[PDB]
Design a binder for this molecule. Structure first.
Ligand SMILES: Nc1ncnc2c1ncn2[C@@H]1O[C@H](COP(=O)(O)OP(=O)(O)O)[C@@H](O)[C@H]1O
Ligand SMILES: [Mg+2]
Length: 147
């Protein structure tokens, strides 16, 4: 309904143990960004395009979830980019275009099932983003402003 959704924000650290531990780093935005998401934004896994600062546009998956820790029902958002970066990019601006929904949130009974699920989400996202209707979003002026 509110896709494609375009947003930008400073990349900020999270809490607990980072998903770098799984080889699947997930970048966070400040609360301000997540708070401006429409409500028709469901929790779950989405896919789209991302660039960092003035960099090239790459495929990405975004997880939108509920935040346990803030008062009121606040959400969380974290983006894994399907690109190998040589350096972290904290403080840089992440530009995202969320283009499609993959699945609702699910409960997993082990890290093995979780990690397999995440990997499968990434492979599915890669395939779907080849569809001409989504492939074109890579070229949106949204991403050209940041270069
Ligand atoms: N492919 C990538 N996708 C997302 N973040 C990446 C990627 N490569 C490097 N990073 C870096 O990894 C950080 C996220 O790591 P992570 O372990 O999830 O910690 P945290 O969530 O606390 O920031 C990002 O802020 C960014 O600096
Ligand atoms: Mg993370």
């Amino acid at each position: 309904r509110h896709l494609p959704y375009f947003c930008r924000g400073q990349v900020v650290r999270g809490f607990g143990r980072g998903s770098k531990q799984l080889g699947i780093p997930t970048a966070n935005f400040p609360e301000q960004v997540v708070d401006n998401l429409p409500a028709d934004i469901s929790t779950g896994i989405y896919y789209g395009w991302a660039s960092v600062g003035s960099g090239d546009v790459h495929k990405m998956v975004v997880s939108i979830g509920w935040n346990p820790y803030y008062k009121n029902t606040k959400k969380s958002m974290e983006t894994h980019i399907m690109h190998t970066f040589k350096e972290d990019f904290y403080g840089e601006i992440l530009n995202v275009a969320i283009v499609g929904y993959l699945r609702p949130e699910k409960n997993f009974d082990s890290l093995e099932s979780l990690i397999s699920a995440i990997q499968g989400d990434i492979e599915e996202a890669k395939k779907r983003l080849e569809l001409p209707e989504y492939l074109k979003i890579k070229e949106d002026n949204f991403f050209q402003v940041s270069k």
